[PDB]
Amino acid sequence: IRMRARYPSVVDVYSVEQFRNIMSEDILTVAWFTAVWCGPCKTIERPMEKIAYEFPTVKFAKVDADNNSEIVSKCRVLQLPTFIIARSGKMLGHVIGANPGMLRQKLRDIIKD
Q1: Hey, which of 4, 47, 49, 93 would disulfide with 100, CB 3.0 to 4.6 Å?
Q2: Choosing from 35, 38, 92, 96, which is the catalytic residue?
């Protein structure tokens, strides 16, 4: 289930357990690793808001790297921003760096097929 009556936008991730529960759900999900004082991360904020609006069947889970360092380590995230795509606990792909167009293309192709 997802929350009803919600503007399509990120869910903020605050714990290792919450992250596991999120990524284990049967919902196509994108974990978005980011940090406040990161230049490339800031550039893609608005593009990401548009992606969340345009893909309302996808959940976008924002993981701040400075506050969730154990999630960063579990997922072997090496640079920011990074996107990891999953559904029902299964790894479906990743996009490295400030590449929202590649993320959009990857989501389109997962949904199509």
Answers
A1: 47
A2: 38
